[PDB]
Symmetry: C3
Subunit: 321 residues, 3 copies
């Protein structure tokens, strides 16, 4: 009957369109990115109630490190606390660190917010305000918001160049993201330059619809996705990437969940024969490059299995009517 040529046709259609005849191999990627662009910074930051002038120019080595583990990071803001040395000092005044008397402090106590071990003594921090005394690197860094203008706010104007090599082992097929002979001088655009590997970070943040400056103040984790729908047949060959952009960070905005991206970097030195340390809280956006792909190539055994599940249907449609 007609419903049978229609069943055959629906099966074969699902084969040809859903690519059931092809064998699919997982993709293998290695990433090499180079960042370009510099930022000039003139800003006034308050340290310990005293105005200080942070000025200067930041180049590649000043704000970034080469990617490792398919992810690179760019510092967009920072807080610097200098001159720390091992000693005893009162903790920074917080809801949990203020003491009325020595009875309020407990010797040897450790608190998740604090950075030192208490000595069980109540001492003044400033004027008549009293905090608990601790043993740590002194003085203790301020509990302060990241500067209201992100010191490296120019970070949206930076340029990231992404090189991606992909290899399918089952089919012995190697290709790279940048095809030979292309005009390298371009800026990636969703339509105008969908294969251009030159990305602007601000463009990236507009794609996902999040403001760059806001994330740049306190940090975040952004992700770049590279898709490969690759066909290794010849009768319909195609194998290029599709760039998409997703914001990965949670954006909880709760003190308990350590929001944004930041980490503590330590630089050690010696003055007057004393072990000393400058502590730098680093704020920035970490970019994670995720590359995924599927390689299809005509396989005879798969066609055999597919018509295998197809023929039983083909006659069952006869038993049905």
């Amino acid at each position: 009957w007609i419903f049978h040529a229609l069943v055959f046709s629906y099966i074969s259609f699902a084969l040809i369109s859903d690519k059931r005849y092809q064998k699919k191999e997982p993709l293998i990627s290695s990433v090499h990115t180079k960042v370009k662009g510099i930022a000039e910074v003139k800003a006034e930051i308050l340290e310990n109630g005293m105005k200080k002038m942070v000025s200067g120019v930041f180049d590649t080595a000043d704000y970034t490190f080469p990617l490792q583990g398919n992810s690179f990071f760019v510092m967009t803001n920072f807080i610097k606390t200098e001159g720390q040395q091992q000693g005893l000092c009162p903790d920074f005044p917080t809801a949990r660190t203020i003491c009325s008397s020595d009875r309020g402090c407990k010797k040897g106590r450790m608190d998740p917010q604090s950075k030192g071990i208490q000595t069980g003594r109540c001492v003044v921090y400033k004027e008549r305000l009293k905090t608990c005394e601790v043993s740590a690197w002194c003085p203790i860094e301020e509990v302060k918001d990241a500067p209201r203008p992100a010191l490296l706010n120019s970070a949206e104007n930076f340029t990231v160049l992404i090189k991606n090599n992909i290899d399918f082992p089952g089919h012995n097929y190697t290709t790279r993201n940048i095809l030979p002979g292309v005009n390298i001088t371009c800026t990636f655009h969703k339509t105008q330059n969908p294969q251009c590997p030159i990305f602007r970070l601000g463009d990236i943040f507009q794609e996902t619809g999040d403001s760059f400056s806001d994330v740049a103040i306190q940090g975040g984790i952004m992700g770049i996705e590279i898709y490969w729908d690759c066909n290794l047949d010849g009768w319909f060959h195609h194998c290029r990437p599709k760039y998409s952009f997703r914001r990965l960070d949670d954006k909880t905005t709760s003190e308990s969940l350590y929001p944004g991206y930041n980490f503590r970097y330590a630089k050690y030195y010696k003055e007057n024969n004393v072990e000393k340390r400058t502590l730098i809280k680093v704020f920035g956006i970490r970019f994670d490059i995720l590359v995924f792909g599927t390689g299809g190539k005509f396989n005879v055994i798969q066609l055999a299995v597919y018509i295998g599940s197809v023929i039983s249907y083909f006659g069952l449609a006869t038993v049905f009517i």
Copy 2:
């Protein structure tokens, strides 16, 4: 017959239970962990036969660096050799470095255990013991065991917070390890808090049944596994992680296989207009976060293929009896 409704029922059962109707997509994860906790260290370490007092407090910046490549490391013990400068010095006495005369040493020789190039001269190291003379950073670090108490033995009391975002692209489904609104203040427990992302390192080492201190002396590689069995149907929806713990390091305990986790960190400075270097052998536990998942969502073509292989069986069971 009855065996036929039983064959139909066994096939359909394997479908409903082994989830044959669903399409399975691979999981995509990015990891962001924050470490919390500090350690106070008072210990006596022998350098060159002289007792020295290692004291002080170690905070986040002092023992760890932000994770990259889905793995973070925590230093648990260390050996420090200070004041090195380019020069000529006798190698540290070993089974392979002791020399009776200049004939025993070979100029320009390189040995896997040694850290310098020999000059072919036999010279005294201490008293009448003689070793081969080498060209390297001097003095050469001691061949010494890591301190019998791990200097940062408090490391089991530390807290690691793990944030995991997972995304299935074929189904356009994004979720994160921490569901919104949960009580963040908890410590992970195999039963009491199986979804709590706050982990204690000592608890981790008890799960895999290995003592934390022993690994902390000379280092090791520990691994955290995060499973996602995710169902994107609705008729039986569920998609949460299962935390499991495996000890990854080999634990060979053979000098040839460089057991444990350690690496050589170099800090450079200048004194009296001389290039100089302090070398620090770092011992610690590296934690590797491995995240895997499968996303199932009802697929009509798969049901078609499955009943496709099912019907042939269904009649063959008739031909059999």
Copy 3:
């Protein structure tokens, strides 16, 4: 007929050979590599038209850092620019930086090749040659080729030891690259020692057919592949790795595509109460360890599905003749 026992036999053959009866699970790997070997460097490098003598010995800490993200790097060449401080200086003379008059320079201009922000002034750089004045770390590094002999040319003689642990979760099977009791003292050979994990970098570069020195001058990205075809049956059990070597870098050799592997490392210090910086351009080869595997174990449901697509064929071959 005979063509039918032949169809049955072809189907069952494809089953037994293409391993259709087995269930395949993806492999999970963590990598731990230790690098061994040192290099002695005596070379004459020209800085600012003045000959300078770079001598000294480089050990593990001097040229490498422990791997993170399944990739380790080894510096093979370097360029060092010392004494930089924040200030105003003329840019290094280039095709884009030479100025005839102040009209040629534009204040506040930024150029991808330059490392500073222009001040719109034309000033002399050397003799009567004039470049545009910029605001940056001064002096600006030379536009110079990497030293004609790679300073760390000895890098091909280095030894990398690779430890790989693989685990299949669906089958609960854990194994490691190094089986217990093997003779560790060996050098990997394609035939003589195909399971030896001790690799020589020069051997690696000969496998892929690229000269080590050439890549060592300006850097590159090399990749080590570890295959696991693992059978968890018993009736034909086998599960060991196959080491293969592929050169991953593009080798474009175009200034626009930033060829080779290099990055900018910054070291900060203070002299006469002035913020200062030494900038080091690092050239080296990054090795990316890619591990892939498939674990097969006899599965009854898969045999059921396979004969499911098989029987329909088995009778259709009867309808055909």
